[PDB]
Amino acid sequence: HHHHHHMVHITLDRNTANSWLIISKDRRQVRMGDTHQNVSDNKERFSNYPMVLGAQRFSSGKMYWEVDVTQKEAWDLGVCRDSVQRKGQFSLSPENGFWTIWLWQDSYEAGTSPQTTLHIQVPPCQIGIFVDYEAGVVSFYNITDHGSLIYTFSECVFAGPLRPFFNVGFNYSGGNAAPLKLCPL
Numbered sequence: 001h002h003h004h005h006h007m008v009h010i011t012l013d014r015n016t017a018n019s020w021l022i023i024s025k026d027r028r029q030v031r032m033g034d035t036h037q038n039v040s041d042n043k044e045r046f047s048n049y050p051m052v053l054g055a056q057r058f059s060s061g062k063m064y065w066e067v068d069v070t071q072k073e074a075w076d077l078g079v080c081r082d083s084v085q086r087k088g089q090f091s092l093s094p095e096n097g098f099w100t101i102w103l104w105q106d107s108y109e110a111g112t113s114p115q116t117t118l119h120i121q122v123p124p125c126q127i128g129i130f131v132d133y134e135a136g137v138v139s140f141y142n143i144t145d146h147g148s149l150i151y152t153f154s155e156c157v158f159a160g161p162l163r164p165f166f167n168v169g170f171n172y173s174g175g176n177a178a179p180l181k182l183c184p185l
């Protein structure tokens, strides 16, 4: 792809994080802790899942960023509405304000309702995310496989400001402790 020139510097918003998450001092990395991280509860924190939002809000333009997923077994990535539900159980779908892909149990799927199978020959170590607000497009790229397209959500109805969206996943296996990292420009 040729989206690299729309690169934006994303930082994570501590106040939105599930209380188990550890965000690095530079606000560029997040991982699962082995316990509650000794923060107060608030209405913004994701309660049920190890999720966090980026601080940046997008309402126009073209935006691109990259995330490192090396050696993780499970994760969700993409964008969401600023007003997505934070508490209780919910599915990742455009109807609920999320435009995401994920890895789970050795298969990759797009967060449509119902979910769509992805066809990935080279397991990605880094994912590129491209948003065109005006066009209503969210696209995902395999940086490990020379930038090959993973999935395009088109005809998106954002219906609000967008935030970068992250889920580090559960670590019940002991094989998913690795962080999500925002990669340098």
Ligand SMILES: CC(=O)N[C@H]1CNc2ccccc2C1
Binding pocket: 018, 020, 047, 048, 049, 050, 169, 170, 171, 172
């Ligand atoms: C080993 C592991 O993944 N433990 C879960 C427990 N439960 C839980 C609930 C919300 C957010 C994160 C978590 C972590």
